[PDB]
Amino acid sequence: LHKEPATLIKAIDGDTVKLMYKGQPMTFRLLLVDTPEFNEKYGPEASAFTKKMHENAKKIEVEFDKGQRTDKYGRGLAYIYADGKMVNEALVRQGLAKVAYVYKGNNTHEQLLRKAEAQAKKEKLNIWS
Ligand SMILES: Cc1cn([C@H]2C[C@H](OP(=O)(O)O)[C@@H](COP(=O)(O)O)O2)c(=O)[nH]c1=O
Ligand SMILES: [Ca+2]
C-alpha cells in the first residue's frame, strides 16, 4: 500500500470526511472502523476527535487498500493519515470506534486495528466503559 496526497475540505463525522483527492472533492469513509452516529452515545466525541485530527494536520494522506476504492454510496474507502498518524487506528485506540466492516481484500490493517481495540477495551475507554 502507498500514501497519496489529499487536503481537507470539511469534517463530517467520526468516520467520514470530505477531502480533495486528485483535485476532486470526495467523501471518504474510513476503512475497518465504525464510529457511533452523531446522535448516538460517543458520536459527538468521535466527530470531534476526527475533526481535530484532520484540521490540526499539516499533511493529510489517503491510503487505499487492495480492493474496492469506492463503496456503494460513492464514498472513497481509505486509511487516512494526519501527519503520519492513522486516523482509523487512533479512533479505535481511543475507544471511539469499533473494528468493523472487515471485508475480504480490503483488510490490510485489520490486525493493527484489533490490537488498538484490545488496548482500548483493556483501558475501558469511552465506548468500552
Ligand atoms: C466501511 C465500509 C462501509 N460499507 C457500507 C456497508 C454499510 O452498508 P449499509 O448502509 O447498507 O448498512 C455502510 C455502513 O457505513 P456507515 O457506517 O457509514 O453507515 O457502508 C462498505 O460497503 N464498505 C466499507 O468498507
Ligand atoms: Ca458510523
From Swiss-Prot:
Species: Staphylococcus aureus
Taxon lineage: Bacteria, Bacillati, Bacillota, Bacilli, Bacillales
Residues annotated to bind Ca(2+): 15, 34-35
Active site residues according to the UniProt entry: 29, 37, 75
Biased segments, Basic and acidic residues type: 109-125
Name this protein carries in UniProt: Nuclease A
Subcellular location: Secreted
Lineage: superkingdom: Bacteria
Region Disordered, annotated ranges: 109-129
